Design an enzyme around this catalytic site. Structure first.
Site, PDB file in Angstrom:
ATOM      1  N   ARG B 393       0.848  -1.182   0.000  1.00 59.16           N
ATOM      2  CA  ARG B 393       0.000   0.000   0.000  1.00 59.16           C
ATOM      3  C   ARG B 393       0.891   1.242   0.000  1.00 59.16           C
ATOM      4  O   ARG B 393       1.821   1.354   0.804  1.00 59.16           O
ATOM      5  CB  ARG B 393      -0.917  -0.025   1.223  1.00 59.16           C
ATOM      6  CG  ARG B 393      -1.886   1.135   1.342  1.00 59.16           C
ATOM      7  CD  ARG B 393      -1.778   1.663   2.747  1.00 59.16           C
ATOM      8  NE  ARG B 393      -3.033   2.167   3.293  1.00 59.16           N
ATOM      9  CZ  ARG B 393      -3.178   2.574   4.554  1.00 59.16           C
ATOM     10  NH1 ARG B 393      -2.152   2.531   5.396  1.00 59.16           N
ATOM     11  NH2 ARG B 393      -4.352   3.022   4.986  1.00 59.16           N
ATOM     12  N   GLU B 503     -10.692   7.324   0.939  1.00 56.97           N
ATOM     13  CA  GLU B 503     -10.704   7.605   2.365  1.00 56.97           C
ATOM     14  C   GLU B 503     -11.040   9.057   2.679  1.00 56.97           C
ATOM     15  O   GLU B 503     -10.500   9.648   3.604  1.00 56.97           O
ATOM     16  CB  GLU B 503      -9.338   7.241   2.938  1.00 56.97           C
ATOM     17  CG  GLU B 503      -8.172   7.951   2.252  1.00 56.97           C
ATOM     18  CD  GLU B 503      -6.830   7.393   2.665  1.00 56.97           C
ATOM     19  OE1 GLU B 503      -6.519   7.455   3.854  1.00 56.97           O
ATOM     20  OE2 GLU B 503      -6.086   6.896   1.802  1.00 56.97           O
ATOM     21  N   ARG B 578      -9.956  -0.404   8.846  1.00 56.77           N
ATOM     22  CA  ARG B 578     -10.071  -0.671  10.273  1.00 56.77           C
ATOM     23  C   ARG B 578     -11.109   0.158  10.987  1.00 56.77           C
ATOM     24  O   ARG B 578     -11.406   1.275  10.571  1.00 56.77           O
ATOM     25  CB  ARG B 578      -8.718  -0.484  10.951  1.00 56.77           C
ATOM     26  CG  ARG B 578      -8.169   0.920  10.851  1.00 56.77           C
ATOM     27  CD  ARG B 578      -6.658   0.939  11.133  1.00 56.77           C
ATOM     28  NE  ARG B 578      -6.294   0.408  12.448  1.00 56.77           N
ATOM     29  CZ  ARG B 578      -6.823   0.818  13.602  1.00 56.77           C
ATOM     30  NH1 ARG B 578      -7.771   1.752  13.611  1.00 56.77           N
ATOM     31  NH2 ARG B 578      -6.421   0.284  14.748  1.00 56.77           N
TER      32      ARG B 578
HETATM   33  O1  DCO Z   1      -9.239   4.398   5.921  1.00 56.27           O
HETATM   34  C1  DCO Z   1      -7.963   4.592   6.330  1.00 56.27           C
HETATM   35  O2  DCO Z   1      -7.384   5.722   6.065  1.00 56.27           O
HETATM   36  C2  DCO Z   1      -7.254   3.595   7.125  1.00 56.27           C
HETATM   37  C3  DCO Z   1      -6.524   4.086   8.353  1.00 56.27           C
HETATM   38  P1  DCO Z   1      -4.645   4.421   8.087  1.00 56.27           P
HETATM   39  O3  DCO Z   1      -4.421   5.353   6.767  1.00 56.27           O
HETATM   40  O4  DCO Z   1      -4.267   5.228   9.528  1.00 56.27           O
HETATM   41  O5  DCO Z   1      -3.918   2.948   8.001  1.00 56.27           O
HETATM   42  C4  DCO Z   1      -7.391   2.255   6.851  1.00 56.27           C
HETATM   43 CL1  DCO Z   1      -6.613   0.972   7.693  1.00 56.27          CL
HETATM   44 CL2  DCO Z   1      -8.377   1.715   5.561  1.00 56.27          CL
HETATM   45 MN    MN Z   2      -5.687   6.482   5.532  1.00 59.16          MN
END
Ligand code: DCO
Ligand code: MN
Ligand code: DCO
Ligand code: ASP
Ligand code: ASP
Ligand code: MN
Lengths: 874, 874
Positions: B393, B503, B578
């Site tokens: 990722r 996101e 998560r």
């Molecule tokens: O939706 C997200 O941004 C996250 C949290 P992260 O960028 O702190 O890993 C996940 Cl796990 Cl899908």
């Molecule tokens: Mn994120």
């Protein structure tokens, strides 16, 4: 009262029955049912079914023999399993219950004449050394002890109410696979096992049961000491040691050569690193604490201050992997310069571990120190680098013959033809000599060379690898000195316990004189360092004159030796052979140890455990803890509360019983000229020597004790263990001295113990099956002898019961009585089947035809199964 | 009803208390008692003791801070332990009870519209893939999961009446050492963990719980299928797969370089051989049967007819030791020609094992085949050669910047400045091009090089090592195509799932358009093979606009995507990030999965499990079986009985709630200029970034989601998980639409699920402790803001309770309610202590003085403990 036991046996029987229906149809199951029912009906007197049973058996095709035999053998095995679980189960007999020890301690505290000081010293002098011996009828290609440990775990877990439905269903699924595995994973030995295989078998007992068992027993021992006496034993005090004969005993076993012994010694060391490696890995993970005492901080110093404990343990692991690596090389026949951190002494392992312990204890972390650390620390003194020490045993004759060859070669004369006096003279002269005796380049005979090489292995092996050198057939002082001389010409650089083995009626009677003479030789006194070991061969002696005479001779010999040494300031350690009342195990054993001559256990307990009994005395860790506890309680009580001295009148009855019984016994075994032929027909004696059973292999006086006893155990007569006892007792009764006998039974442990041993033998004997064998394998001309021996038992059982004022055999031991009854039931069919197998086998070789593999293997299954169901029969 | 739980917690507390009295006196125990009592008295309103508590805390010497913190942390840990045992206990909640699955199957059979055929196909399409993520607050130097497995075993064994006295005494002795070990063996991380450490932590979860857990769950699954539906799933069908992000996720984590990933990949393969080696060793011992099918007899042929099965397994063991040997070399940085039997594909392991299985099944030995063999066979498809696959990722931005650097170097132009149209044009042109684009000898910037090397690792790793490539911050179609281009210029020789991660509120709203455009590009349709993966970033979206808006946006996006793909014949697999209701675990999770848009689970279940929750979802094998079962039941029901479509009027209320709540939320997080300063004082946000917690590390829009949520969880306000929800609900109520809301709560799962999540957050929040932090760390000028946020929660709790027609928070979940109440009690003291620690820490750095090691470590213990007691808070 034994409903839980009956249930478990029934539940396991079903699981096995279902596992059989899948494997190879249900026809086999029908056969097993038909034979089981017919046999029972024949015993009840139905002569019609007796013929039906006979026919049923002759109709079994050679393809059914094996499956059928295995079925019966399996049912018996599950029966034994259920029985062993019931013994150590809390709701059952609770054999591993620490109470067994507490009961003894409390008994000693309530004794007025005993002061806590004299008891404290008795505990500090505690000493147990168990010597593992090979299993005479182990037919499996690989050891299956680990599996039984799992089957037991399933029973322990299932033995609980409030148990979840899906939880019970899960345990049953595992139990079904375990049983199924035993039915499909069965590899009967095609060939006779080698000493190295028997040695590996012993290793399996160590890691699957002794490894956990000893530390657990020591843990409980201390806890009970402090709770009842008010103190624990010092950490450095580990009163238990395990030794083995596999790879060491070469008595009448040409297969145990100097090379095999050398190999087995490396293999043990190797296994020791494997098991200690696991132990150390744990400590390297748990012992991470930082705070440590100044001293410990020194041993580690710089680079080791961060993690002092974790440090030492990693050097120990590197040390171990080093030696292990070397051993694996030597084991493959590859020579290589030994590494630096090569481990050869237990002291090397104890040093670092003990240091860590000392520290943790000081810096306020006792709970940790007395955890996994204390366990490994104890395994070091109980097993150590060699894992399990070994004894070397060879017969006096071989030593004599090698020495005679040596003297004739040198022109000195012929040792073999010199009188006892001349031999002693020669040996004492050469033992003090600084000039070597053994030629540098000598080409002696094969046998003599083996005697010489074995001694070379002893001298080369690290000190602590060999525990003692036993001399079979010891008769004279020169037999003992001879071995000391050979060890000297070998380069032995330390004291080596040399123990005479008196295994004859005559030799036992002379034992004391022989030792008195030895101790009068000033030189010999300075060699033994105040410590002497003597071995009593009860089994062979009983085979020589019958159990009655044997027993009385053994008692007198021990008593005389005890006094002879006590007076001479020598600490005497009696080494007990296999069998007898002392080898019964459990409660009877606890009793037999106490019934010995006063002082018999001051030198500690050292006994050779019989192979066929290892499973029942050390099969599981819990059973191991039970056994060692019983022994411990017996030693303490025997050293503080010795048995009463026998009345002069009793000794006179024993002298008479000894003579009369010896007469009757040899009357048949020797004088009767129809015995030998009858013996070879009624018992599978001949096949015990031919089949691939055990490493080591004329007339009766040429046969070995084990085979002697085993043969009469297969046909269920048990002759060797009672033949003349009852007849002699009967005679003394006819003299109106029955009241004298009854008195001895009540007030003299030696005697009550002897009668008890008889009661157990009769309980396992089966006169009906014994008659069955005669009608199937013995010539009609010999039936009269057989029927006579059977009536003899019937009469003996009555006399024995009368003197014990009982109605049934061994009413004092209800549990063992029950266990025996259960085993007799499952053993029954194997006997009925073995007769047919022996008949077919004997018909083939008599026809000239070749031995049928299927018939032979089926025979092995019965022999091994019958022995497993009968256990100790001598 | 929870008496057994209260007891166990009390019994463990004693054992810990006693262990403390030995280690470092009882003074520490007195402190723990004083703080515990004072804190409770202050909460009750006793202002006198509130001052007493404050003084008590300032008087603790720096030498007491650590011991005290650890005490509270330990009590909490034992509380958690007791709680976990009570969950999987038969007499407790019975979480691993197969009934959980049966209940679902039976529900489906009683449904008329459902035909056994449509249900059978639903089971065949079952697919679960759990992705393990690092634990954000793991302060221990080594993993201690194995220890907890043993503490649990002691509790299971002690949980039984009819238990022997000496047996109970024995279990307690072991339990005392286990506790003592945890108290003396505690190595707080001195340094920040590396990706390789987090990866090893994941491996520990696999062997101590997943290794046994998966096969046990699969075992129960089939058993319930056959019992209720009448058939089992084919042996080759293993619907479970485990993947990991440790070593793969490099989003905002500079420490995860191409080398680390390459290393972690070898390390996984290595661990896989270690665990499979143990499995194979067993089979090499048990599978000794001789009878085998003709075909199998071929694979072994000559030299393998004696022991066909035992043969293949030994070649597999040689095969494994070969690759393991090679890996250990590569892991040390040593190059070496790869061996012959090097394993790189699960197919290589499955082939021989499956053959043995096939044979045993035919030759009538299914009980054996479906034993240990079936387990290893399943571990092959669930774990396999790589052990646990990993995803890569990286953020879209990094890809854009690397491509822009590449185009500028070649003189083609500047990718970074081209419109979306031009980028697509350029990418489609180069994706179809046969002429390479990447220069052979190029010296790009550090960042660009990392982007290029990572792709090289993906192309070199055996096929099956990497599961998917996730693109954080995906916004446009070119973000997806960019990665496909780089993978192409890397030499990728197979299809690689590339999933966009939306996101953000805006990105989620555009998600569907972005995918529609992608699917309209004919070339792109032929690349994905009818399979597309999309990731929903709920946590980051909630941080952007608040949970209300976030939730509604996520629902609409998924629903649109489902239809867009359904129509285009593309199988869509939704990847859940998560947190959220889906990451709650247990029953709520089962419910949250069903409340998703119809079709959401047709493409299977794929979710990333949060590190801080791994212990509570997969801590023990039994817990593992429980979790996977709940998931399985949820998937089947959701695919056969989808939720009802929402009424038009409901969608309108959600649109309004979404807007109002987003307004309120950003009103504080962004518009309010006193928030940021207040945020940095009331929460330990600043120290979460500085302390050595986790591998990966401006304004609020610069902070990561995890830290955002964690910070507000430490001071107990939980702001991120409710901030605007209640206020928007309150407004809709003032419009007399409360009855509309109540209706949604009852008939629309999505909505009842959202309110439920709120009820749990409020249940863990503690307004009293939140005020305590303000008075200790926040400037009096900022108190008004704090008191305002607290009153907001009070009001929100009332509205939420009213719409749910309940009297107390989460009355529908009594067990979880209880568990929370218990944890809040033991967590309480850590919060009270953390305020003091944060105060001292902040006073030192403000004084210029150096950070005190003792104060810092004590702080870590509270942070980690508080997180352990609070669990999922977002
Ligand atoms: O939706 C997200 O941004 C996250 C949290 P992260 O960028 O702190 O890993 C996940 Cl796990 Cl899908
Ligand atoms: Mn994120
Ligand atoms: O006393 C003995 O002869 C024996 C029996 P063995 O000569 O068959 O080993 C022992 Cl074990 Cl001490
Ligand atoms: N070991 C028992 C008999 C037996 O269980 O076989 C005894 O010696 O008395
Ligand atoms: N996991 C529970 C809360 C908890 O146990 O902390 C829930 O999500 O409802
Ligand atoms: Mn002998």
């Amino acid at each position: 009262q034994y409903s839980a036991l009956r249930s478990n046996v029934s539940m396991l029987g079903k699981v096995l029955g279902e596992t059989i229906k899948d494997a190879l149809g249900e026809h086999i199951l029908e056969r097993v049912e038909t034979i089981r029912k017919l046999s029972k009906s024949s015993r009840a007197g139905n002569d019609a079914n007796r013929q039906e049973l006979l026919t049923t058996l002759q109709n079994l095709s050679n393809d059914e023999l094996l499956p059928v035999a295995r079925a019966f053998s399996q049912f018996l095995n599950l029966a034994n399993t259920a029985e062993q679980y019931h013994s150590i189960s809390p709701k059952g007999e609770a054999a591993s219950n620490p109470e067994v020890i507490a009961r003894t301690l409390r008994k000693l505290k309530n004794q007025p004449e005993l002061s806590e000081d004299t008891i404290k010293k008795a505990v500090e002098s505690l000493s147990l050394e168990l010597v593992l011996t090979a299993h005479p009828t182990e037919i499996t290609r690989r050891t299956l002890i680990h599996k039984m440990v799992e089957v037991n775990a399933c029973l322990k877990q299932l033995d609980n109410k409030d148990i979840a439905d899906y939880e019970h269903n899960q345990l049953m699924r595992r139990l079904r696979q375990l049983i199924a595995q035993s039915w499909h994973t069965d590899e009967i030995r095609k060939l006779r096992p080698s000493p190295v295989d028997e040695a590996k078998w012993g290793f399996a007992v160590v890691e699957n049961s002794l490894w956990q068992g000893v530390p657990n027993y020591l843990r409980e021992l201390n806890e009970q000491l402090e709770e009842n006496l008010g103190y624990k034993l010092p950490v450095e005090f580990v009163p238990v040691r395990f030794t083995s004969w596999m790879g060491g005993d070469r008595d009448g076993n040409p297969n145990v050569t100097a090379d095999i012994t050398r190999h087995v010694l490396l293999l043990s060391r190797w296994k020791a690193t494997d098991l200690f490696l696991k132990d150390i890995q744990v400590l390297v993970s748990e012992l991470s604490m930082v705070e440590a005492t100044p001293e410990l901080l020194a041993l580690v110093g710089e680079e080791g201050a961060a993690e002092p404990y974790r440090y030492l343990m990693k050097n120990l692991r590197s040390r171990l992997m080093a030696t292990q690596a070397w051993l694996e090389a030597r084991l493959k026949g590859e020579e290589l310069p030994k590494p630096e951190g090569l481990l050869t002494q237990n002291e090397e392992l104890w040093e670092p571990l003990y240091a860590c312990y000392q520290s943790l204890q000081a810096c306020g972390m006792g709970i940790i120190a007395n955890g996994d650390l204390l366990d490994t620390l104890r395994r070091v003194k109980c097993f150590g680098v060699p894992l399990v020490r070994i004894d070397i045993r060879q017969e006096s004759t071989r030593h004599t013959e090698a020495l005679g060859e040596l003297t004739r070669y040198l022109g000195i004369g012929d040792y073999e033809s010199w009188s006892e006096a001349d031999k002693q003279a020669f040996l004492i002269r050469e033992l003090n000599s600084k000039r070597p005796l053994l030629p540098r380049n000598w080409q002696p005979s094969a046998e003599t060379r083996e005697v010489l090489d074995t001694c070379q292995v002893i001298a080369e092996a690290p000190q602590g690898s060999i525990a003692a050198y036993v001399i079979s057939m010891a008769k004279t002082p020169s037999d003992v000195l001879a071995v000391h001389l050979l060890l000297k010409e070998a380069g032995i650089g330390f004291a080596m316990p040399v123990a005479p083995l008196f295994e004859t009626l005559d030799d036992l009677n002379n034992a004391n004189d022989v030792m008195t003479q030895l101790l009068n030789i000033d030189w010999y006194r300075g060699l033994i360092q105040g410590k002497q070991m003597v071995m009593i061969g009860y089994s062979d002696s009983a085979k020589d004159a019958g159990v009655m005479a044997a027993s009385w001779a053994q008692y007198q010999a021990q008593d005389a030796l005890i006094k002879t040494c006590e007076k001479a300031g020598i600490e005497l350690t009696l080494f007990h052979g296999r069998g007898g009342s002392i080898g019964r195990g459990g409660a009877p054993a606890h009793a037999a140890l106490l019934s010995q001559p006063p002082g018999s256990l001051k030198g500690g307990l050292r006994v050779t455990e019989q192979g066929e009994m290892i499973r029942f005395k050390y099969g599981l860790p819990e059973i191991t803890v039970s056994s060692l506890s019983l022994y411990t309680g017996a030693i303490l009580e025997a050293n503080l509360l010795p048995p009463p001295e026998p009345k002069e009148s009793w000794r006179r009855i024993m002298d008479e019983l000894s003579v009369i019984s010896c007469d009757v016994y040899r009357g048949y075994v020797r004088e009767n000229k129809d015995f030998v032929p009858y013996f070879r027909s009624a018992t599978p004696e001949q096949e015990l020597g031919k089949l691939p059973l055990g490493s080591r292999p004329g007339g009766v006086e040429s046969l070995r004790a084990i085979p002697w006893i085993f043969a009469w155990t297969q046909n269920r007569l048990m002759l060797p263990a009672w033949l003349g006892a009852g007849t002699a007792l009967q005679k003394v009764v006819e003299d109106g001295k029955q009241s004298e006998l009854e008195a001895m039974c009540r007030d003299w442990p030696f005697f009550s113990t002897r009668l008890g041993m008889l009661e157990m033998v009769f309980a396992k004997a089966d006169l009906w099956l014994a008659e069955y064998y005669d009608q199937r394998l013995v010539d009609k001309a010999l039936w009269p002898l057989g029927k006579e021996l059977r009536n003899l038992q019937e009469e003996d059982i009555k006399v024995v019961l009368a003197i014990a004022n009982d109605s049934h055999l061994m009413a004092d031991l209800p549990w063992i009585a029950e266990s025996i009854q259960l085993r007799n039931i499952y053993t029954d069919p194997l006997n009925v089947l073995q007769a047919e197998l022996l008949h077919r086998s004997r018909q083939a070789e008599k026809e000239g035809q070749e031995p049928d593999p299927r018939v032979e293997q089926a025979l092995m299954v019965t022999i091994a199964g019958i022995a497993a169901g009968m256990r100790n029969t001598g």
